[PDB]
């Protein structure tokens, strides 16, 4: 009985929200902003090529000094690099070879990783005995493990195919919060600069915005057609960019709760594997199934300044804090530095 | 390398040592076979017992100088792709007793072993090990011919 009434209430709420969003759709981003010069042709080139991985690369992550890097691949290894001299600093062997993600601690003391084993592991770098050892193992998710990011030396947040996300306490080892509400497999997430919010995209084609402190769903976002593969976050703290399997990436602003602009081209009919921004928010960088990493603008919606060197699919790419370099890993087992 | 300090050369040496150890591991691990076991609902353990046998559960057996590692993802019986995101390069597949499996673009050239290549299993048919060994050797020969242009 109450089901029909609640359905009608949900329909009314949906109509109200749609009309509230339409009440502010003044014009497109392009129309108000015809005052922008294109950056022009942007050409980069391989300064350094990092060699040593023996299988496909699935994830990388920069250190916070803009000089050290961690990378993970299916040959069951986790390497730390010196990008100035191409030296190798550490190499860490993993228990399970079906990994999917990794992170580095903003202080320099810890790294993390995980995948199909349903566990997230934590590694201490600065020990008094001169090696790297495991500090923690987090257990309690039911599906596989997709993404993770330290907040400090004692707090990490982690997403799963359970249709759930969680917050942990590394000292004890328990979830201090859980976030339920999706329907399909959660696939990605990005932290805000102040580490007080986060975003996460899933298989059910939607997204949701979450608050760490309180712990309930705040906002949601529709606009794609297939599942969501990649999500990053813009420098303001108000934006985040998706990249999906319908061959599209999209931009947004949280305070206006409506999609703004797309990034597509008919010559590309593949899926986006990864995204990332640049300091000014003037260089969106997106990898693709079709072997080459494009370089998009942000406001004028129209360009792809290829970074073509790789002979297979691109999995992952990221830019430093000082903003002077870019790395890409690939299914061909190479890492490359660019500027 | 004449503009290197005394401390930069020590870093160079330990990087070289790391490279050596990585190459040894890779040479060791380049010669193992990975098999993805599949099957319908309770259509599978009958084979899993015959070869003397939360999370991905993976088994392990050896036979005639080939190192075999078999995996099972049968817990998820719903339409599965967030596991096919990561199994793209497997050597073969083993059934036990279909449109989505054999008619996908990433499995364009991926053979599949079948149990009722085809075979019949009985209670004392220990030849179920020789059969899978033979099939994988045939797959390997085709791979090598296709790589060196000779086919």
């Amino acid at each position, epitope marked *: 009985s109450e089901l029909d009434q609640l359905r009608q209430e949900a329909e009314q709420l949906k109509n109200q929200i749609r009309d509230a969003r339409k009440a502010c759709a003044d014009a497109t981003l392009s129309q108000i902003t015809n005052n922008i010069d294109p950056v022009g042709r942007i050409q980069m080139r391989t300064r350094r090529t990092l060699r040593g991985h023996l299988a496909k690369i699935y994830a990388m992550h920069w250190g916070t000094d803009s000089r050290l890097l961690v990378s993970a691949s299916q040959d069951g290894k986790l390497i730390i690099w010196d990008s100035y001299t191409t030296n190798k600093v550490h190499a860490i062997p993993l228990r399970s070879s079906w990994v999917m993600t990794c992170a580095y601690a903003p202080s320099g003391n810890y790294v993390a990783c995980g995948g199909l084993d349903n566990i997230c592991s934590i590694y201490n770098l600065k020990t008094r005995e001169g090696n790297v050892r495991v500090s923690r193992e987090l257990a309690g998710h039911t599906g596989y493990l997709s993404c993770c990011r330290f907040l400090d030396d004692n707090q990490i947040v982690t997403s799963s195919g359970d249709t759930t996300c969680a917050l942990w306490d590394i000292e004890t080892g328990q979830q201090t919060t859980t976030f339920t509400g999706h329907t399909g497999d959660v696939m990605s997430l990005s932290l805000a600069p102040d580490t007080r919010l986060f975003v996460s995209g899933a298989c059910d084609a939607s997204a949701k915005l979450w608050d760490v402190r309180e712990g309930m769903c705040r906002q949601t976002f529709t606009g794609h057609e297939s599942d969501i593969n990649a999500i990053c976050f813009f420098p303001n703290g108000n934006a985040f960019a998706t990249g999906s399997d319908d061959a599209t990436c999209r931009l947004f602003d949280l305070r206006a709760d409506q999609e703004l602009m797309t990034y597509s081209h008919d010559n590309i009919i593949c899926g986006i594997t990864s995204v990332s921004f640049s300091k000014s928010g003037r260089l969106l960088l997106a990898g693709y199934d079709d072997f080459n990493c494009n370089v998009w603008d942000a406001l004028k919606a129209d360009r792809a300044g290829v970074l073509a060197g790789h002979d297979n699919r691109v999995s992952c790419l990221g830019v430093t804090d000082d903003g002077m370099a870019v790395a890409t890993g690939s299914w061909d087992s190479f890492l490359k530095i660019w500027n | 390398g004449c503009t290197l*300090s*005394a401390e930069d050369k*020590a*870093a160079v040496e330990r990087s070289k040592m790391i490279d050596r150890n990585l190459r040894e591991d890779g040479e060791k691990a380049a010669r193992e076979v990975k098999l993805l076991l599949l099957g319908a609902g309770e259509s599978k353990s009958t084979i899993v017992k015959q070869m003397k046998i939360t999370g991905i559960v993976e088994t392990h057996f050896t036979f005639k100088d080939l190192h075999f590692k078999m995996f099972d993802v049968g817990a998820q019986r719903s339409e599965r792709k967030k596991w096919i995101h990561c199994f793209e390069g497997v050597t073969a597949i083993i059934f036990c007793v279909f449109d989505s499996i054999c008619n996908n673009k990433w499995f364009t050239d991926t053979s599949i072993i079948l149990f009722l290549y085809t075979h019949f299993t009985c209670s004392t048919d220990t030849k179920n090990v020789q059969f899978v060994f033979d099939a994988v050797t045939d797959v390997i020969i085709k791979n090598n011919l296709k790589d060196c242009g000779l086919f």
Partner: single-chain antibody
Amino acid sequence: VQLVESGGGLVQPGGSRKLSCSASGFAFSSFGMHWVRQAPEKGLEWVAYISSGSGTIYYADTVKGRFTISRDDPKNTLFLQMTSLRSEDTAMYYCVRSIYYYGSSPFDFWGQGTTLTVSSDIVMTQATSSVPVTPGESVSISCRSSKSLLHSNGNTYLYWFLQRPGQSPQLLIYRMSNLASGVPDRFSGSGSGTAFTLTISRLEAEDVGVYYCMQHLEYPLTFGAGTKLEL
């Protein structure tokens, strides 16, 4: 972590002797080792080197070709073999621990020593042989260089050690400005190329001894005379 070494005593002229060092508590095969000596009244003085991997070996110009350094990784022990001992070589000999990658701290653990008795390059000069001190007062020490220690890569390879009356040396400041782990935070040091000063705040007790400065820019490694605080 511990480093215990033995093999000392006294010998007749000519002669020979071997020394050894036993390690326990860390990963011995990823470190590089040194031997450092000290005459019964003078300062410290370096002897030899060997890398992690056994690829490089260095020797001091004073006794090069008449000593020998070697190791044994699977059982964690270090050796030095020396022959034809002269009347000068009477001193105490130490074993020191060291590791090099981007950001490591070298020279950060010393042993307990062992006594032996027998019957161009950069210069580093301590300011004053001894200074009178009073508790609670800020105090400062200084030594100086001949060449510039600053490199093109942007570092400055000068070191500071402290030795309390009756013990082994302890690392304080590495690469001229960085403070080692387990050291009270009241120390600090800086300087301009070829001129350097170590400074202490709120002078405590148990901070009596002799302060030393070492350079690590090119082999050989060289020491200063020492600067003793009196109390």
